[PDB]
Amino acid sequence: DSLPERIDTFTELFNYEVALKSYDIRILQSNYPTKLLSPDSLLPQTSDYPLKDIQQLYSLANTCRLPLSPLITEPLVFTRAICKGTQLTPRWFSRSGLIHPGGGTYAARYVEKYPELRPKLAQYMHIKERDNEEDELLESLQNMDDDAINALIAGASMFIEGKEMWLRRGDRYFVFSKDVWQENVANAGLSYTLASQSKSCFVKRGNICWDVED
């Protein structure tokens, strides 16, 4: 038929009423903001901060003995609270950028100093900083590779999370079992390769590099 047309046919073989799970995209967005799912949040934040100011903030946090920069005003109060032992409310976390200029969240660093506030501030931590002390959606999110999580952030058509496949259909994502989606791959006339394990990924849908079968 066509490689891209076979992927359109692939999505039509699914029964979106007998899906193992289903998630409203707007609900998922309010429970998990992008900054708390994104792999870039765990990195030093050189895209939003100048490398020189990141150095000065880290030096102030290491010693506890306020640099002049236009962006470091919010990170500076976090450093003050950490050094002096003062409090920051959940209101503060909800209105912050959530991400510390050195990577990771403000809520995880704060909970490292006050471990008893973990339940109150868990929703402000990155999914990779949470231990899941309460969750099925959090567990699926945590087991997504960087390409699958970034494809969920972007609203991509589909992606493989472990053994299950998530497929978008409007404002929801439907999750299907390994047996159901693998048979549809053969029923459509397709082969797949994970983006992380492929040399070339020219027909990419999320975390999936599609090809024809033989």
Residue corresponding to tokens 């289903």: 22
Binding segment for Cl ion (CB under 5 A), chosen from 45-53, 74-82, 108-116, 150-158, is 150-158
User: Considering the complex, what minimum distance in angstroms separates the CB of residue 15 from Cl ion?
Assistant: 21
Nearer to Cl ion by Cβ, of 157 and 182: the residue is: 157
Task: Name residues whose C-beta falls within 8 Å of residue 104's C-beta, 6 or more positions apart in sequence.
Answer: 41, 42, 126, 129
User: Considering the complex, what minimum distance in angstroms separates the CB of residue 214 from Cl ion?
Assistant: 25
Nearer to Cl ion by Cβ, of 71 and 203: the residue is: 203
User: Considering the complex, what minimum distance in angstroms separates the CB of residue 137 from Cl ion?
Assistant: 21
Nearer to Cl ion by Cβ, of 54 and 148: the residue is: 148
Binding segment for Cl ion (CB under 5 A), chosen from 3-11, 14-22, 39-47, 157-165, is 157-165
Binding segment for Cl ion (CB under 5 A), chosen from 53-61, 85-93, 148-156, 177-185, is 148-156
User: Pick from 156, 175, 190, 208: which binds Cl ion (CB under 5 A)?
Assistant: 156
Taking CB atoms, the residue at the shortest distance from Cl ion is 157
Using the rule CB under 5 A, is 157 a contact of Cl ion? yes
List residues near Cl ion by CB under 5 A.
156-157, 205
